[PDB]
Amino acid sequence: SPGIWQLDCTHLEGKVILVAVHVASGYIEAEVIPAETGQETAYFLLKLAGRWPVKTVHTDNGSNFTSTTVKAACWWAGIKQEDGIPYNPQSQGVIESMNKELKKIIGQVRDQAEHLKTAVQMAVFIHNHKRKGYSAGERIVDIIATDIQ
Amino acid sequence: SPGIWQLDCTHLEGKVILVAVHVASGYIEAEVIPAETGQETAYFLLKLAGRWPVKTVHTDNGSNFTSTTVKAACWWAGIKQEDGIPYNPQSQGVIESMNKELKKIIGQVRDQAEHLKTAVQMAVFIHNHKRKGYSAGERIVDIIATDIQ
Ligand SMILES: C=CCN(Cc1ccccc1C(=O)NCC1CCCCC1)Cc1ccc2c(c1C(=O)O)OC[C@H](CCC(=O)O)O2
Ligand SMILES: C=CCN(Cc1ccccc1C(=O)NCC1CCCCC1)Cc1ccc2c(c1C(=O)O)OC[C@H](CCC(=O)O)O2
Ligand SMILES: [Cl-]
Ligand SMILES: [Cl-]
Predict the structure, then answer these.
(1) Domain of life, per the record (chains A, B) (predicted)?
(2) Ramachandran region of residue B18, left (φ > 0), alpha (ψ -120 to 50) or beta?
(3) How many Cα atoms are found within 13 Å in the side-chain-facing hemisphere of B11?
(4) Which CATH architecture has domain B1-149?
(5) How far is Cα A72 from Cα A79, in angstroms, rounded to an integer?
(6) How many CB atoms lie within 10 A of CB A97?
(7) Residue ranges covered by each domain of chain B
(8) Mutate which of A141, A144, A147 to disrupt the B interface (most B C-beta within 10 Å)?
């Protein structure tokens, strides 16, 4: 589970916010894209996997699961591409809660930037630093460091 | 030590590659931008600081040191903005070597993508995973986890 991530796509201001969640910690990376295509998703995974040791990704929908470009990125980066079926029903709830929380934070910062992408990065920062007492940023590093050792 | 990063700007294909190096580990993040501006640099630092506990940034040149947009990003993200003067001359050489290494890797992957940005992210992945033994990705996590504990 140190290497397990979940993709999540949410919408705001007629744009798409693509999110990757490190399941065990709740740490996130996110980007704003015009629409959720295989190429956009592939490029996002490529970025993520260069930055964190991504072993497995649960894709956010069937189109990204099927996409040969997404499969190509997962092959390139050594990621096991999996479905995102919530066999554990609590999974849906957690993601939905996170999207609601992220949108709330974006609202709280929205006037501190012209562009949504800037607001989204502020929200990523606030989310990852929030103490809940460790932060998600602390938890991910601790989990991965323990795995290396 | 755990919180110190250095900015670095290099050029390829008439574009600019902006790099942040975690000094203690050699771990990097990078992006392709059309030109180095204060806004581009500010946005890059905002992304970086949401993802890693960035305490101090040594800026890459005087224009980014001076930039009020860069200063605003550093204020927002709680980063101490510093100059990048190589008081230790070995610092110049290290960054020079890294740029040469990155450009080499980009050449090795260049035909595996149409767009330079894709090649640069492949290069980030290869750089961070390269065992020299531990990888830079392993070193950064271990350094930061040790700090937290
Ligand atoms: C003079 C800068 C323009 N903005 C002024 C602004 C406009 C409206 C409200 C507040 C502020 C404001 O000063 N906020 C304080 C502070 C500055 C930003 C970091 C922390 C918050 C801010 C900004 C900076 C970099 C960006 C932005 C944006 C944006 O407004 O969204 O948008 C995406 C762009 C992408 C990279 C590229 O394309 O160069 O990088
Ligand atoms: C059908 C995809 C188009 N490319 C085909 C290609 C073209 C030439 C050579 C090899 C390949 C090839 O299949 N390489 C294998 C493989 C592809 C997945 C990544 C690992 C390597 C690849 C690609 C994917 C996403 C991107 C790209 C690019 C690009 O070619 O650079 O460019 C930036 C763009 C930004 C996000 C956005 O704008 O959607 O995301
Ligand atoms: Cl963090
Ligand atoms: Cl890594």
Answers:
(1) Viruses
(2) beta
(3) 4
(4) 2-Layer Sandwich (3.30)
(5) 10
(6) 10
(7) 1-149
(8) A141
